[model samples]
Structure formats: structure tokens, C-alpha cells
Target: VGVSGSAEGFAEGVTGGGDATPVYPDTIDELVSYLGDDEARVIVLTKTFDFTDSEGTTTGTGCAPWGTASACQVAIDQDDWCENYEPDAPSVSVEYYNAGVLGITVTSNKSLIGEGSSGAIKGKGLRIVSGAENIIIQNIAVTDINPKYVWGGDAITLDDCDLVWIDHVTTARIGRQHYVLGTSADNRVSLTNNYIDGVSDYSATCDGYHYWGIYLDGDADLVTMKGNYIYHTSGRSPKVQDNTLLHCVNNYFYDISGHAFEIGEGGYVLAEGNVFQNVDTVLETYEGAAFTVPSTTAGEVCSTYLGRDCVINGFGCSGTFSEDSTSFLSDFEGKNIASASAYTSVASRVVANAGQGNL
Candidate 1:
């Protein structure tokens, strides 16, 4: 309910028809048509619309754990790199896919709100690509999104977009990444009161190699994240890169294996007032990244401990990055971030207020 500054404010400017006529679509195609037109403001959903039944090319069959290399190759060839299907020592030189599930490009100044859990967007995901702005997506569950390529696209993506708000929604069982923000200069973006479970129906949870929770990078800057629940993601609770500035506060990370935050390519993140449980690595910065030396006493200590001092002072670490990773309760308890006791209620609070049901 507390939809914070800038992005939320601009998104509020879009009433999505307010008391006027709203477009209620019955199918994904019908819903997509309204999404393409900028003049079209409001869209209401009544039921779950499957995306597998859409216009994309359907090749190869069966759920993940694809036994044969050809089955995995067919998917990977089309840019879907199904992470769960490939063997441990892959004979491929392929990296992860950047394309989404069929890429349903969203329009600006629109509000796509669903009618609770019964209302959902299945199959493919939504992408707010270049130049889209002032949009609001709330009260929906984007589930059962299994595309031709395993983990090909994320549940929702915002690239080169601005002034957007995503709230009171549950995004689950998506391939690869749950939600991603990229492209140059994606600012004034707010994500609040949502449940992000980064696992697909076919993919396993907490199996850290592939499924990233929220991958934020690619020249992105100034994002506001608050009151969200990220579970079973393993790592990348909110990864950052490319000269970015992120204000992450009051969020909860649970059942994670990799580091909570991955700062790369010289990005700066203010990870304050957050909660973590059952997580392996809490904070990490890559080699090429420039960990901004904080301009204060505690910040200087953190900067030194995680930066030059980590290697020079011989804290048993031999790299530029520091993974004081499992110190969520010890190293950061009452010192770095907020106290664990102060944030123990975050889980319950997020569960009570997050997801489509609360909307």
C-alpha cells in the first residue's frame, strides 16, 4: 500500500481509465492488443490465459532433464538454453539467453491489473522494452510460463524503460530469471510487496547454477526495491552492474545459496534494512567491479574490509572481492544492516501483504 516515490508517482498519473471504460480481455491475444496501443490505458483480466497455445514455434517435447544432447541442442539453438536439461559438463560454448518467451512487448502509460489468483498470464512473459514508460502492473500472478526454450525468458522484464511500478503480485515458476531489468538507464523503477519465487514448474528450486532471482544490470541505475519476498533463488537476490546506483531496503531473502547481492562492473548499492535467512553468501563484489568506497566511518571499514584490505591485509582471502557471505546474522546483525530481531517479522508481513490475493 505504501507505493514509494518517483516511479510510483509517475505510474500513478496513469489511471488506466479510472472511472472510465476499461478493456477486459478474455484471451492472451486480446490482452496483447490492448498492451500494444499506448492510448489504451486500462486492462482487466478474468481468468488464466495460457501462452503455450500462442503463435510461437513449438519444437522439441517433454519437461526438463532432457536426456539427449539433441533435445537440449534444439532448444539452445533457438536461443533458449534450457539450463536444467543440459548435462553437468556441457560440450557447448553457449551462454544464457537474453531473449524472453516470444517477447510480448508492452506499451507505455497502461495499467494491467488482474482479478486475484484466478486471473493469470500463462505460457509467455511480458516485456517492457525500449522507450516504454509510466506503466503499472499489479494484482496478478504470472505463472505456468514454460516456453519452448527452458528458462529462455523471465517472468517479467523491464529494459530501457522508466517510471514503472510492479506491486501486490506473485511471480512464480519462471525460467532462468524471475524478473530482470536491463538496457541503458532504467531509472525510477519501484518493485514492492511482491512474492518472487524463481523456479519453473520443470526446474528445481535452490539449485543455484541457473535460476537467478532478480538480475539487475546492463547500465541500469536508481531502482527502488522494498517489502518483497524472494525465496529459493539461491543467489542474485538483486544483482547489479554497469555503473549503477540501487537503493535496496526492507526486503527478505530466504532459501538462497549464492550471495544475496552481486555487485559487478563498478556499481554501487545501498543494501540497508534487509533480512536474510538460510542463505549461504550475503554480500559479494566481482573483480572488475569498483566497490565504491563509502564516505563514512562504518562505510570506510566495510569498503576496506571488502576491497583492498581483503587481499593486502591477508584476511585469508586472495581476491579483490569479498564473500563475507554467511555473516548475515553475525557480521551484519546489529552493525552493517538492520538487526535480525528487528526484521524477523518481514517474512510474515510480506506473505500477508504480497501477491495477487492481497491486491
Candidate 2:
């Protein structure tokens, strides 16, 4: 079916900036400041941005101002840590964090577009703070975001927001997550045609200190995750928890070290037409719901929910069965899911035409 449920709401965000003048900013500070302007319906990027240049250029004097390399200044350690630790390998040098804060904080009723292919918007990250509405982010590559300063910062975060569309973007090497959506009521968001991968990076020792890839928790609801390629990182290629309704469809997952997708409390995962390759756990459900496949490919693997008085469909079942969120949401909220047949081929199709610069 065409986009339905909360996904239909994103069209409003797309059109909300109608008849308004566009603002083109050349620097990181100008871009960040323009995002807060309510009159600015459109904001476009002219170049890529990052904090990595400052690392080696200004901060690369002696090993340490005080002592040896090991006892160097914190700035030297922060900037040149990888050079000392990993002498053989190169780092994803475009660091994005701005002194423990997100690089950009987007406001409501605006469209932030980056120059396609030739331009990128890299930095600490982008945050649409609590209670914002009608925002659109497109045509950008967000990467090299190491949010170790804030622990759980994400590349793009939507907190208590409404009517947003994140499209035609590629995000990689994000510290904690690629995207995070959190709200108590409906957020009405759609993430379409994006490539999110390699969420882990070597902070110092190539240790791969990473966490979930994309997280939608804290009572968020009404998400449409469609037509994307999510790979690498440990797992949780969009983990759903806290009673959220995540309509995940037509996505591809590959080289995932952990579960490709998960469903937990208040989660209504309508997963259809997807592909999983080299993933350890295909689908996982926790805590709140008992789920039933209702349908699946022949001999294809799937997850089992654990709850009281549950039902089952498909063969070769494994994992605990549950019943809490089996019927939490309807099969389709005013639209239908496509046929589950040929889901194994989704990766081939999606990889050919996913991410920015294609549109």
C-alpha cells in the first residue's frame, strides 16, 4: 500500500515550507543559527563540516605540553589519540561533536537540504529537540559522529516531535545511534530511502565501542521505516521499545553482528518485505508482547515471542512465545502491507537505489 497511518502526516512537513524564500549558509555556525529561524522555510548547505581539522592542525604541537605522549594534554589526547594508538590504520577523520553538544539543533516548519553528492553535513550531530514539529532533513551524509562526551548522543534525534520526514540521507560511524525517536504520543515520522551503516568507530584502541544502531524508545509511536539499507554495528538496526508502533517495511539488513530488529513493550512491529543477510538474530521481541508471524516464507527463519496464551504461524520456530503485544495494533492502520514473497531479494533492489544524491 501507499504510505499510511502516521506516515501520511509527513507530506504535511514536505509542503509546509511552501512559498517561502530559501536560506543558503556557508559555515557551520551560520547553518546552526539559521535552523532556529522560524521564518526560514528552507536552509541549504554549501559544504561539508567537521571538527577533525582542528584536531591535528591547531592541537598538534608536541606530544604533550606537560610530559610525554601518554601524559599529554587532554586536547592532544582527544585529537591525536588514534595516531598514537593505531599507527597503521587511518581514522574516519571528520569528527562532528561540538564540545559535548550537538552540532545542529533544528527547529520546526523548516526544510534542511544539503547539496547532493558534492556536499555533506558532518559534525557532532543534529537534534530536533522536544516538542518541535513539521521538520524535513534531506540530501546529506552524516558521519564520523563520536558522541563519547554525552554517552548516548545520536546522529539524528527526534524527541517529542511531530510530522517529520527524513529522506535521501546516508549516516555512518555514529557514536550511539544513527537515528532516535522518542515521544509519549504520536511522532508521525517517516524515514525513507536512507543508507545507515558502520555505526561503530575506533575511539582509541579500535575497540569498537558502539551500541544500538537506531533506537525508537520512550513511548514513541507511529513510525514508518521504509526502503533503507542498515548494516554493520553491533545490532538494533532500529530497536523498538516502550510501546511504540513501528511499521518497518521493505528494508535491508546485512553484516549485522546483533539482532537486525527487535520489538519490546508498547511495540507494534509490522515487519514485511525485508531482507536479512549475515545477521545473527533476525528478529527479537522482548518484555511486553506475544507476537505471531501470521505468515512467512517457506523454511525462512523468524523470531518467537514469550508471553502467556500466544499463537504461532510458520515452521522451524525458536525462542520464547508471548501474547501481550500480539494484537496491540491492527494489521494495517488504514493501509495494507505488501506481499511477503520475494523478501530475500530486497537487498539487491534497495542497494541499487538507496541513500542521498539519487533524488
Candidate 1 TM-score over all chains jointly: 0.71
lDDT of 1: 0.57
Alpha carbon lDDT at 306, candidate 2: 18
lDDT of 2 at 113: 71
Per-residue CA lDDT of candidate 2, range 13-65, in tens?
Answer: 34434446777777766776777766647777657866433333222222222
Candidate 1 stretches greater than 4 Å from native = 1-20, 60-75, 78-100, 147-151, 199-210, 286-344
Error of 2 at 33 (Å): 2.0
CA RMSD per model (angstroms): 8.6, 8.7
Looking at candidate 1, the ten consecutive residues that score lowest on lDDT are 309-318
TM-score of 2: 0.71
Assess the local accuracy of residue 357 in candidate 2 as a C-alpha lDDT between 0 and 100.
70
Where in model 2 is the C-alpha error above 4 Å?
Answer: 1-13, 51-97, 147-152, 183-186, 203-210, 290-326, 331-345
